Curated annotation (Swiss-Prot), chains A, C, E, G, I, K:
Protein name: Insulin B chain
Organism listed in the record: Sus scrofa (Pig)
Full-sequence portion shown in this chain: 25 to 54 of 108
Encoding gene per record: INS
Length: 30, 21, 30, 21, 30, 21, 30, 21, 30, 21, 30, 21
């Protein structure tokens, strides 16, 4: 696996790929 | 956090696994 | 309704869109 | 959960906001 | 709903989510 | 227009509904 | 042809790509 | 319309340009 | 496994993610 | 190939890296 | 067809649309 | 290359066909 530069919805896509089934939490600092 | 890091810098997929359920 | 099905990565795209800076959780087992 | 509500069934964006933090 | 920063194809994705069935018109200034 | 605004600035989903058919 | 089916948000992605600065309309009822 | 032509059937990119403004 | 099916453009999204700077090939006939 | 392995069947990300250059 | 400004995964999406069935090679300079 | 060009500049779809198999 390679390092990632992921902004915006691209990071939700990478989380969804990484966690699959388990799901994930998307928690931006804000 | 992770949102911020992957975007301003870089992040690995294994760092992202820390956000799975 | 005539509401469309959101699946997979399109379902997380749609949560990103709706929730954005509030963050969201995606938990298919829930 | 969300998968049953918005992918197997159908859901509004309004409904999608039940999964916002 | 949260405000959006949407560029490029990300804005067509948000339109498609918002208008669904009705469809939409994508009309960049140019 | 809207294309330009959401990208240079910000825009709401309710502003986007002005582009549905 | 061996042409693939473009549905949903992939169909609007493909119109964005093709039409870009000309803009396009997406009207599923048409 | 486009849905019948490119999602229920199949269409080229050439055909997709019938829906450009 | 509980591994999900990756099809189409989601399959190339996932290769981009995994391979990134190494590049990848996507060859459905292979 | 990849389509049979990851779309008709299912494949891990580990497996997806067999198609990296 | 219009010219394209495509970065990141957006360029893999455009390749996948352009080459379809033939598939493509994604080969970033690095 | 092409990756770089479409992102720093612009590129056409016909330039992208040079990357199909
Ligand atoms: Co983007
Ligand atoms: Co899809």
């Amino acid at each position: 696996f390679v390092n990632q530069h992921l902004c915006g919805s691209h990071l939700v896509e990478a989380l969804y790929l990484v966690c699959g089934e388990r799901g994930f939490f998307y928690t931006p600092k804000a | 956090g992770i949102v911020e890091q992957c975007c301003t810098s870089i992040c690995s997929l294994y760092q992202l696994e820390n956000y799975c359920n």
